Amino acid sequence: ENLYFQGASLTEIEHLVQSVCKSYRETCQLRLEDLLRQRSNIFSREEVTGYQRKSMWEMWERCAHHLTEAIQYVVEFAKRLSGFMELCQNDQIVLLKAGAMEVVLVRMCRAYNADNRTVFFEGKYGGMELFRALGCSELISSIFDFSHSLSALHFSEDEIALYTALVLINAHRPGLQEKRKVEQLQYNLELAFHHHLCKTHRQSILAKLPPKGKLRSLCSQHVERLQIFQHLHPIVVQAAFPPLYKELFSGG
């Protein structure tokens, strides 16, 4: 079914590095240079007040739409990753349901400016106060703290590519039917990531990567806050939340 479901040679691992980085480049959503250039475009006090005056439901709908757009690029990244399309449909869906949001949270560090603690949102950069109408300040604070931590690593785009491929191809996800196939693909992607780090004298970032429990806790908090919002505005979720968002986070 795929070369990377068995033992891969050093030459095949070098091919895997190139292939992952290419798949990431073609699905990164926004170019890094385009995000860095826009750092000087910052929401004014008046604009921040405008976002804070939005209703909780309108802010939740807007943020769910933006997360769904980011998730669609991650689905395409997964489809282009060596071996992913050769997994059975059950497993492709298990990996995407568990890992798409984790990949989005990692990619988000590219849009976060640690100099002023702001994130790109709807054309400009804003602090966590921009999202106060959501009524989930712990979750926003946790996401900003996470982005701040990854921003201190100074990830290159190729490092984000290799790291997010591994975030997705995780053989420990519950529900996997072909667990051994996923383990071998994960082993080869782990060699590709570690080979690239070795070659670029960046192996010191491995001990600094966040624990898997950290990405899990953020995803769990997101689902918990969505459940709370859904109890308050069930018809908003039913009528105006994106279908893909509901499939991933509310079971339909």
């Binding site: 449909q89 492709q92 869906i93 279908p243 893909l244 499939e247």
Partner: peptide, 12 residues
């Protein structure tokens, strides 16, 4: 009962 994932996966 939203099932967009299988559609995105199957679309080539």
């Amino acid at each position: 009962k939203h099932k967009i994932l299988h559609r995105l996966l199957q679309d080539s």
